[PDB]
Design an enzyme around this catalytic site. Structure first.
Site, short mmCIF file in Angstrom:
data_model
loop_
_atom_site.label_atom_id
_atom_site.label_comp_id
_atom_site.label_asym_id
_atom_site.label_seq_id
_atom_site.Cartn_x
_atom_site.Cartn_y
_atom_site.Cartn_z
N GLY A 20 -6.63 30.78 -61.54
CA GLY A 20 -5.97 30.36 -62.75
C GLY A 20 -4.72 31.18 -62.95
N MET A 24 -9.11 34.93 -58.39
CA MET A 24 -10.52 34.69 -58.66
C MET A 24 -10.87 35.36 -59.99
SD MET A 24 -12.27 37.49 -56.10
CE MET A 24 -13.06 38.69 -57.17
N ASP A 135 -6.37 27.30 -78.03
CA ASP A 135 -6.20 26.68 -76.72
C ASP A 135 -7.43 25.88 -76.28
OD1 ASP A 135 -4.80 25.96 -74.47
OD2 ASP A 135 -5.16 27.84 -73.39
C1 LIG Z 1 -8.42 32.18 -64.29
C2 LIG Z 1 -8.29 32.52 -65.62
C3 LIG Z 1 -8.95 31.78 -66.59
C4 LIG Z 1 -9.72 30.70 -66.22
C5 LIG Z 1 -10.44 29.89 -67.27
N1 LIG Z 1 -11.74 30.53 -67.49
C6 LIG Z 1 -12.81 30.43 -66.67
C7 LIG Z 1 -13.82 31.17 -67.23
C8 LIG Z 1 -15.19 31.35 -66.69
C9 LIG Z 1 -16.05 32.36 -66.99
N2 LIG Z 1 -17.22 32.19 -66.31
C10 LIG Z 1 -17.16 31.05 -65.54
N3 LIG Z 1 -18.02 30.46 -64.72
C11 LIG Z 1 -17.69 29.35 -64.10
C12 LIG Z 1 -16.43 28.78 -64.30
C13 LIG Z 1 -16.07 27.52 -63.60
C14 LIG Z 1 -14.81 26.95 -63.77
C15 LIG Z 1 -14.51 25.78 -63.10
N4 LIG Z 1 -15.39 25.22 -62.30
C16 LIG Z 1 -16.59 25.73 -62.11
C17 LIG Z 1 -16.98 26.89 -62.74
N5 LIG Z 1 -15.56 29.35 -65.12
C18 LIG Z 1 -15.89 30.47 -65.75
C19 LIG Z 1 -13.32 31.73 -68.42
N6 LIG Z 1 -12.08 31.34 -68.57
C20 LIG Z 1 -9.85 30.36 -64.88
C21 LIG Z 1 -9.19 31.10 -63.92
#
Ligand SMILES: c1ccc(Cn2cc(-c3c[nH]c4ncc(-c5ccncc5)nc34)cn2)cc1
EC number: 2.7.11.24
Length: 332
Positions: A20, A24, A135
């Site tokens: 993102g 990772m 957001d």
């Molecule tokens: C960089 C920065 C921010 C994000 C958005 N963001 C993601 C999480 C998150 C926390 N724990 C998880 N566990 C599984 C998944 C996940 C997502 C997409 N597909 C499958 C599984 N996302 C998260 C919090 N915020 C992304 C990248």
């Protein structure tokens, strides 16, 4: 370590999930608690707004505690502030999100109804702490099952401030940005979160963004293209006095949609923030009457004393505050 750089202990055999803002995001395994978790690796110390979003999400998520709000499990860094160049946020591993789900599946009304309920149940908590998410979008709603929804990404999360006037202040994701933000109604109101949820409900009903504008002027073009025509906008930007449109009935945009759902949708997607439905009133709508139960809707103990009004701080300073906050996750 691996390729994709990172650092276990205490987690091993990770897996790429994407990138993102900062790398990772990788699904690794927990040696102590015996589960698969999701570690997020942050390298924000090169700018200012970066650490800001990092420090904010850390400060807020640690104080929050709710079933519909993602929690911080562990945070590993270098034991010395001189070496600290990377931060690893450890959170619960969720199977997917609402964004991915809406690409491969049409949701039934029953599933949509409970998804909406869980979102508002989580929002109820957030707002009770006098905090704005700012957001909310399908990719920020993590899913494990139909009964397990968790709100994430509090990097833009501010403490509410209706009275105060905040190309600065950036951003809210365009497709889900409330009209008042684009018309310099500078106050941080709770109404902006409700708008996002409205767009989110609209997206669940048809598997596509209700207002997919190209740029912010095109966004207002899309918004008025549905709600119809309603000036304080002192930019230019002024010449929006263009084709006047009539309000499009929701049942014409969503013919197979439950009427109670569309009625609640109309109240969330209200142009005027002061008329726009609040979070408790939303939960108390006839559309969610089978789920609405205040005794099972935990709110925050007390509203947040301010986010310290921290915007213009030197990066070496908030470097330490992150270090001060994350010191609890050191084994010592
Ligand atoms: C960089 C920065 C921010 C994000 C958005 N963001 C993601 C999480 C998150 C926390 N724990 C998880 N566990 C599984 C998944 C996940 C997502 C997409 N597909 C499958 C599984 N996302 C998260 C919090 N915020 C992304 C990248």
């Amino acid at each position: 370590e691996m390729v994709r750089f990172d650092v276990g202990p205490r987690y091993t055999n990770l897996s790429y999930i994407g990138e993102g803002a900062y790398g990772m995001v990788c699904s690794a395994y927990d040696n102590v608690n015996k589960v698969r978790v999701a570690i997020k690796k942050i390298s924000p110390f090169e700018h200012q707004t970066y650490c800001q979003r990092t420090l904010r999400e850390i400060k807020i998520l640690l104080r929050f505690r709710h079933e519909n709000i993602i929690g911080i499990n562990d945070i590993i860094r270098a034991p010395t502030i001189e070496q600290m160049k990377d931060v690893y946020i450890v959170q619960d591993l969720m199977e997917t999100d609402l964004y991915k789900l809406l690409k491969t599946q049409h949701l039934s009304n029953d599933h949509i109804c409970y998804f909406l309920y869980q979102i508002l149940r989580g929002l109820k908590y957030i707002h009770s702490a006098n905090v704005l998410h700012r957001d909310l979008k399908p990719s920020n709603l993590l899913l494990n099952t139909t009964c397990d929804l968790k709100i994430c990404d509090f990097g833009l999360a501010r403490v509410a401030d209706p009275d105060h006037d905040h190309l600065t202040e950036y951003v809210a994701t365009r497709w889900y940005r409330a009209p008042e933000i684009m018309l310099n109604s500078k106050g941080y109101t709770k109404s902006i979160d409700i708008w996002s949820v409205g767009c989110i409900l609209a997206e669940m009903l048809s598997n596509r963004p209700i207002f997919p504008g190209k740029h912010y002027l095109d966004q207002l073009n899309h918004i008025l293209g549905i709600l119809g025509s309603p000036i304080n906008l002192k930019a230019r930007n002024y010449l929006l006095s263009l084709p006047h449109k009539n309000k499009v009935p929701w049942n014409r945009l969503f013919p197979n949609a439950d009427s109670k759902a569309l009625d609640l949708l109309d109240k969330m997607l209200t142009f005027n923030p002061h008329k726009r439905i609040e979070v408790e009133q939303a939960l108390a709508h006839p559309y969610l009457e089978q789920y609405y139960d205040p005794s099972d809707e935990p709110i925050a103990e007390a509203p947040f004393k301010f986010d310290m009004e921290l915007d213009d701080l030197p990066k070496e300073k908030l470097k330490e505050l992150i270090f001060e906050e994350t010191a609890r996750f050191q084994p010592g």
